[PDB]
mmCIF file of C-alpha atoms in Angstrom:
data_model
loop_
_atom_site.group_PDB
_atom_site.id
_atom_site.type_symbol
_atom_site.label_atom_id
_atom_site.label_comp_id
_atom_site.label_asym_id
_atom_site.label_seq_id
_atom_site.Cartn_x
_atom_site.Cartn_y
_atom_site.Cartn_z
ATOM 1 C CA UNK R 1 86.818 -173.616 60.180
ATOM 2 C CA UNK R 2 87.593 -176.406 62.773
ATOM 3 C CA UNK R 3 89.044 -175.947 66.106
ATOM 4 C CA UNK R 4 86.396 -175.665 68.826
ATOM 5 C CA UNK R 5 86.279 -173.289 71.805
ATOM 6 C CA UNK R 6 84.423 -174.360 74.889
ATOM 7 C CA UNK R 7 83.319 -172.533 78.013
ATOM 8 C CA UNK R 8 81.202 -175.010 79.988
ATOM 9 C CA UNK R 9 82.294 -177.913 82.194
ATOM 10 C CA UNK R 10 82.602 -181.071 80.173
ATOM 11 C CA UNK R 11 84.704 -184.024 79.190
ATOM 12 C CA UNK R 12 84.937 -185.832 75.877
ATOM 13 C CA UNK R 13 87.124 -186.887 72.984
ATOM 14 C CA UNK R 14 88.531 -184.376 70.544
ATOM 15 C CA UNK R 15 90.776 -185.178 67.628
ATOM 16 C CA UNK R 16 91.454 -188.598 69.128
ATOM 17 C CA UNK R 17 92.405 -187.382 72.625
ATOM 18 C CA UNK R 18 90.425 -187.309 75.827
ATOM 19 C CA UNK R 19 89.894 -183.843 77.252
ATOM 20 C CA UNK R 20 88.500 -182.371 80.417
ATOM 21 C CA UNK R 21 87.494 -178.795 81.240
ATOM 22 C CA UNK R 22 86.218 -177.651 84.604
ATOM 23 C CA UNK R 23 85.812 -174.374 86.395
ATOM 24 C CA UNK R 24 83.951 -172.882 89.333
ATOM 25 C CA UNK R 25 83.947 -169.495 87.559
ATOM 26 C CA UNK R 26 81.997 -169.921 84.305
ATOM 27 C CA UNK R 27 82.604 -167.136 81.841
ATOM 28 C CA UNK R 28 86.126 -166.370 83.030
ATOM 29 C CA UNK R 29 88.046 -169.174 81.294
ATOM 30 C CA UNK R 30 87.882 -170.975 77.986
ATOM 31 C CA UNK R 31 89.614 -173.882 76.256
ATOM 32 C CA UNK R 32 90.313 -174.120 72.534
ATOM 33 C CA UNK R 33 90.717 -177.630 71.200
ATOM 34 C CA UNK R 34 93.390 -178.022 68.493
ATOM 35 C CA UNK R 35 94.540 -180.956 66.341
ATOM 36 C CA UNK R 36 95.867 -184.045 68.013
ATOM 37 C CA UNK R 37 96.922 -183.739 71.582
ATOM 38 C CA UNK R 38 96.923 -179.941 71.612
ATOM 39 C CA UNK R 39 94.777 -177.262 73.256
ATOM 40 C CA UNK R 40 94.897 -173.690 74.446
ATOM 41 C CA UNK R 41 93.446 -171.893 77.429
ATOM 42 C CA UNK R 42 92.679 -168.291 78.194
ATOM 43 C CA UNK R 43 91.536 -166.929 81.531
ATOM 44 C CA UNK R 44 90.759 -163.409 82.853
ATOM 45 C CA UNK R 45 90.050 -162.714 86.555
ATOM 46 C CA UNK R 46 89.113 -166.321 87.131
ATOM 47 C CA UNK R 47 88.300 -168.572 90.088
ATOM 48 C CA UNK R 48 89.598 -172.127 89.951
ATOM 49 C CA UNK R 49 89.964 -174.144 86.728
ATOM 50 C CA UNK R 50 91.661 -177.206 85.335
ATOM 51 C CA UNK R 51 91.800 -178.053 81.641
ATOM 52 C CA UNK R 52 93.766 -180.574 79.644
ATOM 53 C CA UNK R 53 94.135 -183.347 77.048
ATOM 54 C CA UNK R 54 95.372 -186.899 77.460
ATOM 55 C CA UNK R 55 93.751 -190.263 78.075
ATOM 56 C CA UNK R 56 90.531 -191.472 79.666
ATOM 57 C CA UNK R 57 92.502 -194.305 81.293
ATOM 58 C CA UNK R 58 95.826 -193.376 82.762
ATOM 59 C CA UNK R 59 98.876 -195.572 83.285
ATOM 60 C CA UNK R 60 102.659 -195.735 83.296
ATOM 61 C CA UNK R 61 103.098 -194.434 79.742
ATOM 62 C CA UNK R 62 106.088 -192.275 78.878
ATOM 63 C CA UNK R 63 104.779 -189.015 77.431
ATOM 64 C CA UNK R 64 106.307 -185.950 75.759
ATOM 65 C CA UNK R 65 104.883 -182.442 75.888
ATOM 66 C CA UNK R 66 105.564 -178.925 74.698
ATOM 67 C CA UNK R 67 103.916 -175.821 76.118
ATOM 68 C CA UNK R 68 103.625 -172.074 75.994
ATOM 69 C CA UNK R 69 102.765 -171.278 79.620
ATOM 70 C CA UNK R 70 101.838 -167.617 80.355
ATOM 71 C CA UNK R 71 100.226 -167.136 83.767
ATOM 72 C CA UNK R 72 99.891 -163.781 85.509
ATOM 73 C CA UNK R 73 99.602 -165.253 88.901
ATOM 74 C CA UNK R 74 98.971 -168.678 90.466
ATOM 75 C CA UNK R 75 98.884 -171.474 87.829
ATOM 76 C CA UNK R 76 100.510 -174.828 87.171
ATOM 77 C CA UNK R 77 101.525 -176.938 84.159
ATOM 78 C CA UNK R 78 100.992 -180.501 85.351
ATOM 79 C CA UNK R 79 100.566 -184.123 84.269
ATOM 80 C CA UNK R 80 97.425 -184.665 86.311
ATOM 81 C CA UNK R 81 95.215 -187.630 86.957
ATOM 82 C CA UNK R 82 93.039 -189.716 89.223
ATOM 83 C CA UNK R 83 92.619 -193.163 90.598
ATOM 84 C CA UNK R 84 89.817 -194.955 92.395
ATOM 85 C CA UNK R 85 89.925 -197.637 95.133
ATOM 86 C CA UNK R 86 91.662 -195.766 96.577
ATOM 87 C CA UNK R 87 90.546 -192.331 95.430
ATOM 88 C CA UNK R 88 93.712 -190.252 94.800
ATOM 89 C CA UNK R 89 94.550 -187.307 92.594
ATOM 90 C CA UNK R 90 98.096 -186.781 91.471
ATOM 91 C CA UNK R 91 100.135 -183.995 89.980
ATOM 92 C CA UNK R 92 103.512 -184.153 88.190
ATOM 93 C CA UNK R 93 104.250 -180.400 88.185
ATOM 94 C CA UNK R 94 106.577 -179.183 85.436
ATOM 95 C CA UNK R 95 106.086 -175.404 85.818
ATOM 96 C CA UNK R 96 104.223 -172.977 88.017
ATOM 97 C CA UNK R 97 103.402 -169.252 88.377
ATOM 98 C CA UNK R 98 103.726 -167.134 91.495
ATOM 99 C CA UNK R 99 103.470 -170.122 93.866
ATOM 100 C CA UNK R 100 105.390 -173.398 93.862
ATOM 101 C CA UNK R 101 103.249 -176.228 95.200
ATOM 102 C CA UNK R 102 104.288 -178.006 98.353
ATOM 103 C CA UNK R 103 102.980 -180.435 100.986
ATOM 104 C CA UNK R 104 104.396 -183.075 103.327
ATOM 105 C CA UNK R 105 107.884 -183.784 101.927
ATOM 106 C CA UNK R 106 108.487 -187.484 101.191
ATOM 107 C CA UNK R 107 111.711 -187.461 99.217
ATOM 108 C CA UNK R 108 112.939 -186.917 95.662
ATOM 109 C CA UNK R 109 112.873 -188.740 92.309
ATOM 110 C CA UNK R 110 115.409 -188.059 89.531
ATOM 111 C CA UNK R 111 113.954 -188.761 86.117
ATOM 112 C CA UNK R 112 113.982 -187.248 82.638
ATOM 113 C CA UNK R 113 116.945 -184.998 83.393
ATOM 114 C CA UNK R 114 115.456 -183.364 86.476
ATOM 115 C CA UNK R 115 115.015 -183.904 90.141
ATOM 116 C CA UNK R 116 111.502 -183.645 91.621
ATOM 117 C CA UNK R 117 110.395 -183.160 95.212
ATOM 118 C CA UNK R 118 107.705 -185.564 96.328
ATOM 119 C CA UNK R 119 104.799 -184.438 98.490
ATOM 120 C CA UNK R 120 101.583 -185.719 99.948
ATOM 121 C CA UNK R 121 98.598 -183.588 100.870
ATOM 122 C CA UNK R 122 95.004 -184.341 101.831
ATOM 123 C CA UNK R 123 91.710 -182.814 100.507
ATOM 124 C CA UNK R 124 88.768 -182.553 102.880
ATOM 125 C CA UNK R 125 85.161 -182.878 101.864
ATOM 126 C CA UNK R 126 86.096 -181.806 98.410
ATOM 127 C CA UNK R 127 84.978 -182.238 94.826
ATOM 128 C CA UNK R 128 86.301 -185.347 93.194
ATOM 129 C CA UNK R 129 85.436 -187.650 90.338
ATOM 130 C CA UNK R 130 83.423 -189.535 92.985
ATOM 131 C CA UNK R 131 81.640 -186.582 94.568
ATOM 132 C CA UNK R 132 82.329 -185.026 97.915
ATOM 133 C CA UNK R 133 85.139 -186.954 99.511
ATOM 134 C CA UNK R 134 88.270 -186.848 101.715
ATOM 135 C CA UNK R 135 91.259 -188.201 99.856
ATOM 136 C CA UNK R 136 94.967 -187.989 99.192
ATOM 137 C CA UNK R 137 96.871 -185.961 96.640
ATOM 138 C CA UNK R 138 100.280 -187.035 95.450
ATOM 139 C CA UNK R 139 102.820 -184.627 93.964
ATOM 140 C CA UNK R 140 106.115 -184.611 92.126
ATOM 141 C CA UNK R 141 107.308 -181.010 91.721
ATOM 142 C CA UNK R 142 110.328 -180.329 89.493
ATOM 143 C CA UNK R 143 113.117 -178.422 91.216
ATOM 144 C CA UNK R 144 113.424 -176.112 88.220
ATOM 145 C CA UNK R 145 110.621 -175.129 85.870
ATOM 146 C CA UNK R 146 110.372 -176.399 82.360
ATOM 147 C CA UNK R 147 107.880 -176.212 79.577
ATOM 148 C CA UNK R 148 108.847 -179.089 77.282
ATOM 149 C CA UNK R 149 110.219 -182.552 77.605
ATOM 150 C CA UNK R 150 109.581 -186.200 78.407
ATOM 151 C CA UNK R 151 107.830 -187.468 81.538
ATOM 152 C CA UNK R 152 108.472 -191.151 82.323
ATOM 153 C CA UNK R 153 105.297 -191.440 84.376
ATOM 154 C CA UNK R 154 106.121 -194.877 85.793
ATOM 155 C CA UNK R 155 109.232 -193.519 87.496
ATOM 156 C CA UNK R 156 107.013 -191.091 89.483
ATOM 157 C CA UNK R 157 104.551 -193.788 90.377
ATOM 158 C CA UNK R 158 107.353 -196.048 91.596
ATOM 159 C CA UNK R 159 108.964 -193.286 93.722
ATOM 160 C CA UNK R 160 105.580 -192.497 95.243
ATOM 161 C CA UNK R 161 105.076 -196.135 96.103
ATOM 162 C CA UNK R 162 108.459 -196.277 97.861
ATOM 163 C CA UNK R 163 107.250 -193.407 100.060
ATOM 164 C CA UNK R 164 103.988 -195.227 100.912
ATOM 165 C CA UNK R 165 101.906 -193.208 98.440
ATOM 166 C CA UNK R 166 99.821 -195.963 96.799
ATOM 167 C CA UNK R 167 97.664 -195.489 93.730
ATOM 168 C CA UNK R 168 94.356 -197.176 92.862
ATOM 169 C CA UNK R 169 92.807 -198.097 89.528
ATOM 170 C CA UNK R 170 93.386 -195.340 86.997
ATOM 171 C CA UNK R 171 90.824 -192.906 85.758
ATOM 172 C CA UNK R 172 91.819 -190.066 83.423
ATOM 173 C CA UNK R 173 95.343 -188.671 82.886
ATOM 174 C CA UNK R 174 95.862 -185.297 81.208
ATOM 175 C CA UNK R 175 98.509 -182.693 80.572
ATOM 176 C CA UNK R 176 96.753 -179.874 82.406
ATOM 177 C CA UNK R 177 96.784 -176.157 82.852
ATOM 178 C CA UNK R 178 95.572 -175.363 86.381
ATOM 179 C CA UNK R 179 94.806 -171.885 87.611
ATOM 180 C CA UNK R 180 93.575 -169.975 90.663
ATOM 181 C CA UNK R 181 92.500 -166.351 90.295
ATOM 182 C CA UNK R 182 94.895 -165.549 87.809
ATOM 183 C CA UNK R 183 94.662 -164.231 84.312
ATOM 184 C CA UNK R 184 96.739 -165.841 81.625
ATOM 185 C CA UNK R 185 96.941 -168.213 78.759
ATOM 186 C CA UNK R 186 98.570 -171.495 77.699
ATOM 187 C CA UNK R 187 99.023 -173.722 74.689
ATOM 188 C CA UNK R 188 99.910 -177.314 75.456
ATOM 189 C CA UNK R 189 100.622 -180.383 73.272
ATOM 190 C CA UNK R 190 100.938 -183.914 74.651
ATOM 191 C CA UNK R 191 101.566 -187.322 73.087
ATOM 192 C CA UNK R 192 102.856 -190.725 74.068
ATOM 193 C CA UNK R 193 106.485 -191.504 73.665
#
C-alpha cells in the first residue's frame, strides 16, 4: 500500500511536500496524503479544520493547482500561509462553499485571468503559529470561483502592500482546504510553476 491517512494534528513532509493538518474537532476530519503535492480531505459534522500541502517556507513563487472541492456548507479552497515579525496570516481564496469571505475592503488585484477583492481582518486572542495572539489577516478573494489554475503569489503580495497590508518573514505556505461545521470532501494538487 502507500498513501497515508491521518487524523491527529501534525505537520511534516510527505512525498517531498510540507503538509499541515489541524482541527479542533478530532475524529470528524481526516487527511489522506497522496503522491507529490496532492492530498484529500474528508469531514463529517466537523468543527473547524485546515489541511494542506505546500512549503515550509513561503514566498512569491508562482504556483499551479487543481482541485475537486465538494463542501456541504462553509468551506474554502485557499492558498494560505503565515508570516512572523509581524505575525500575519493570509488567504488567497479561489473557491468557497455557502459563505464568501469578506472583511474591510481595500481594493482589487487582477492576476491570473481573474479579479480578486482585497480585505483585511483582525483576529483577537486567537491561536496562531506563535500561540495566543492578536494579529492581522490578509485576503484576496476571487470574484468568481474556480478550482484549477495558476496563482502568481507575488502579485497578491504586491497589491496587499499597496493597500498598507505588510507581510513579515514567511513561515509555511500551503494550498489548503478550510472548513467550519460542514461535511464534505476535497482532493487538491499543488506545485510550483
